[PDB]
């Protein structure tokens, strides 16, 4: 025998196939699996990994977020160079809080109907991942983007709300209930809002 | 325990903001009202058949009570309550030993 204590703890949960039943997702995975192994680009490898990911791990992105980070890169970019193609492995959703956006080329798995209308009306173009593979096979001049997930309600519930320093929402259908003892100093004690780590 | 009849302490009222002489009086609980909300609920619960509807405490263990003092500022007439440690014999004595 060989002493291999805790060797199984070194292994990691790595998925190679997708759980998706979408045939067009499988076509994209087939296309970008080929590109991630026959090209040297790091963009194709990252895109291929994100196509295998679950829906929860492909958070959607707002149109205002794309335009903001595009402007942060538009400055400090030479006028000779064209703007990169924004690529997100996920959904692009419209944002009613920002009406005036520049013309951008956006590639995404799915566009909401309003988001596609807003991109086109600004002079931009909504791209498709098989179109991207033909104009940027190695991902040259692209802006890979991810949607936000820290604001999800599931994340806001994670952890115990009764321990000091915690601010997670409890699981409760009634908002008025679960507010008296343990939440106010007058009723026995209050859960401490801050704790040094 | 012997306690002075007058105490000079800080009066936090906006018209004093200084150390003033306070008259010392032991706190005594007031009478239970008949029309306090909990009393009204208790009387409604106790009516009719069913006997004693609430617990009645019996296993007394303490032999003392915490001492509470009502201190009244001479000028503002406001009252402040302070808590002393438990004692078996609390006495207000101006005569220093």
């Amino acid at each position: 025998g060989v002493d291999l204590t805790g060797i199984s703890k070194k292994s990691r949960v790595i998925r190679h196939h997708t759980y998706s039943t979408n045939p067009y997702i499988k076509l994209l995975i087939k296309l970008y699996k080929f590109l991630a192994k026959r090209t040297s680009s790091g963009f194709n490898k990252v895109v291929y990994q994100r196509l295998i990911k679950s829906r929860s791990n492909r958070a959607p992105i707002s149109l205002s977020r794309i335009a903001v980070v595009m402007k942060r890169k538009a400055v400090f970019t030479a006028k000779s160079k064209a703007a990169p193609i924004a690529v997100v492995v996920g959904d692009v959703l419209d944002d009613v809080r920002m009406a005036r956006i520049p013309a951008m080329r956006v590639c995404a798995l799915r566009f909401s109907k309003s988001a596609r209308q807003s991109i086109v009306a600004a002079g931009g173009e909504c791209l498709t991942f098989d179109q991207l593979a033909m104009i940027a096979p190695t991902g040259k001049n692209t802006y890979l983007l991810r949607g936000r997930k820290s604001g999800r309600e599931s994340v806001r519930h994670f952890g115990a709300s009764g321990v000091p320093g915690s601010h997670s929402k409890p699981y409760a259908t009634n908002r008025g209930k679960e507010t008296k003892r343990g939440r106010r100093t007058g009723r026995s004690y209050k859960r401490k809002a801050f704790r040094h780590v | 325990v012997n306690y002075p009849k007058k105490k000079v302490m800080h009066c936090g009222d906006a018209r004093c903001n200084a150390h003033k002489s306070f008259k010392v009086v032991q706190y005594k609980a007031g009478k239970a009202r008949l029309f306090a909300r909990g009393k009204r609920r208790y009387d409604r619960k106790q009516s009719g058949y069913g006997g004693q509807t609430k617990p009645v405490f019996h296993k007394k263990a303490k032999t003392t009570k915490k001492i509470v003092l009502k201190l009244q500022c001479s000028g503002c007439k406001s009252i402040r309550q302070v808590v002393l440690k438990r004692t078996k014999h609390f006495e207000l004595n101006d005569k220093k030993k």
Binding site: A160, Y171, A172, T173 | -
Partner: protein, 54 residues
């Protein structure tokens, strides 16, 4: 163990379930399509009787 869950208030502590010893207290809607057809049939029958009144 229990874990972090909502405190349940599902009620259902009465004799609602029909079984032996309990008639139950339930109401299903398996007759909903048939009653919907009947109501439309009755409305069309009534219009013929009161014709030409609205």
């Amino acid at each position: 163990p229990k874990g972090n869950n909502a405190i349940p208030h599902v009620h259902q502590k009465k004799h609602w379930n029909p079984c032996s010893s309990q008639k139950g207290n339930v109401k299903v809607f398996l007759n909903q399509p048939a009653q919907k057809h009947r109501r439309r049939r009755l409305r069309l029958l009534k219009a013929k009787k009161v014709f030409p009144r609205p």
